[PDB]
């Protein structure tokens, strides 16, 4: 199963990881140190993109997602509660890399512990419904993930070219497919 059928994957990609379709033209995943890091950035990146592109559409089902910057607790008041909450949370994820188990235990309520788990796939609290089963989901995750990541840059270059959001830029394309491309 390969990004370019009939290719041989590169040596370092062996179909162990979820959504390894033999893709590293610049042996980015070459050193195990870096490939362990890049695994995370590729989860988290999609998770933020999936979350965001999910938002853009459903917030416009309205006004320009792009000029949403302009919206009851001042700017610096809100940027604080983000900063401390995001700093708190991101450090704790970043310790799970620093040492694979180092954090799992509720510093307050130490009765409650997060059970032994693979990196970047934490569960316990964070897997309540224990939904659809095993790896397959992690392969939907990174697929649905990349598509979401791409779509975002879309949504951005779509704004920074048309002026409209995503659903309007599509409605514009439908109206004149032959005309509304980048090639015009």
């Amino acid at each position: 199963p390969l990004w370019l059928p009939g290719s041989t994957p590169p040596a370092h990609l062996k179909g162990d990881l979820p959504g390894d379709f033999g893709f590293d033209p610049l042996g980015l995943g070459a050193n195990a140190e870096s490939l362990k890091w890049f695994k995370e950035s590729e989860l988290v990146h999609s998770r933020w993109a999936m979350a965001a592109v999910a938002g853009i559409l459903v917030q416009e089902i309205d006004v320009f997602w792009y000029n949403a910057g302009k919206e009851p607790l001042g700017p610096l008041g809100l940027l604080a509660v983000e900063f401390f909450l995001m700093h708190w949370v991101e450090v704790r994820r970043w310790q799970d890399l620093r040492k694979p188990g180092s954090v799992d235990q509720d510093p307050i309520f130490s009765q409650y512990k997060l059970p032994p788990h693979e990196v970047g796939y934490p569960g316990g609290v964070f897997a309540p419904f224990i939904p659809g089963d095993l790896a397959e989901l992690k392969v939907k995750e990174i697929k649905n993930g990349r598509l979401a990541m791409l779509a975002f840059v879309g949504f951005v270059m779509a704004a920074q070219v048309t002026g409209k959001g995503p659903i309007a830029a599509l409605q514009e394309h439908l109206a004149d497919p032959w005309g509304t491309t980048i090639f015009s």
Binding site: A11, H12, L26, G27, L28, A30, N31, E33, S34
Partner: protein
Amino acid sequence: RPVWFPGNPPPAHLDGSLAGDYGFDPLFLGQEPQTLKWYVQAELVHGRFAMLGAAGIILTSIGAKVGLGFPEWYDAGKVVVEKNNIDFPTLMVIQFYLMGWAETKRWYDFKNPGSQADGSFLGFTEEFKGLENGYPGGRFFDPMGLSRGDAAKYQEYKQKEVKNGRLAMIACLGFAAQYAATGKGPLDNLADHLADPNHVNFATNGVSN
């Protein structure tokens, strides 16, 4: 193996072991092996500064030839200085401190393989190791770790890097000898040559150069 001057064999002191080794030292400069170890870094850095510089002009210049905002590389120092708050003497001195530091440390890696490696700094031990005269690597110099990936994948880039290096060094000096002979930007030198190439050459104004 391939050579600069086909037929003429390459001089002994060149193995075919170093990146971009095309048997070219017609003047016997880099003969004594130490004095060539020195030149393989001059060439790399020269090419790395030249590449950043060429990429540096090639983007400002289209930026100026795409929207009437950005300044031409020649008269784009004063434009940075005058418009913005900053002074020349201090920059030139600040630079010399940081570049002074940055160099003076590379300076003591040429003569001593793994010198700055000793942690005698900020406890940063393993990042300032030797490795290979010209490629320092570690978490800082090669963050992504193409350095510590694969044998062939890295060997091919040494090749890519020196070549781009040597082409940017040429490219850069053209920028510098093209503003000189014609007094215009390198996408005015390029637009004028695409519209009427047979006439807009050196043959017109640009002399032997």
